[PDB]
Amino acid sequence: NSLALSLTADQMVSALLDAEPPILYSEYDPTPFSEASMMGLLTNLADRELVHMINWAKRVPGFVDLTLHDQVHLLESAWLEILMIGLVWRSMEHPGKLLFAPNLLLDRNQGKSVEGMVEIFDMLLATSSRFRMMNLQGEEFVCLKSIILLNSGVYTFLHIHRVLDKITDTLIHLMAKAGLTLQQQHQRLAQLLLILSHIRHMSNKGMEHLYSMKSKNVVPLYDLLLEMLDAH
């Protein structure tokens, strides 16, 4: 089976760092936010990012080995978790702020601009503080994003596990090479995986938020964004 199962931890990391999508800039500059202008800004950015995301998924070892149907199902199920972790990751060096784009750094308050938005902002920020605190590494980050893509919809399914194990192997390798003890390795591996179920949770609230914003007719009906939204 899969060629991904015969990569060395270092090859694996290399593949993942390679597949990284570009960091998009917001295609408008706020400069007073408004519920409709804010949702159009964030939503505009997300829609674009989804195109690059699809390209990225095709480069994660073992992903393309799945059927078109399973591939579709995996992305529909994790697109937001993936947008979110990408967000928290680049927001690491910006205490109390969310760096949606190099040219769009918002903070908790501007989150008040939209209904039921601040809570989600706070959760994201908490995740970002946690990663900062843990001194998450880029090599670790791309392993986490891949575990999310592959692990999110697998039991909502009704090879993947082999690839997940491989990725766990890689994370331990990174941790070992960094000098952590066997105990510190397991603990950190657990701490990172645990943060994942929180990102899952933020994703669920996010879906509900995005869906309500649609009802309120505040969000521009982007084709791909909506399809992903309806998937659930």
Binding site: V51, I54, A57, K58, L68, H69, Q71, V72, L75, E76, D223, L224, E227, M228
Partner: peptide, 9 residues
């Protein structure tokens, strides 16, 4: 509707 299966194509 369907856009995803095509992009992955």
């Amino acid at each position: 509707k369907x856009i995803l299966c095509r992009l992955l194509q």
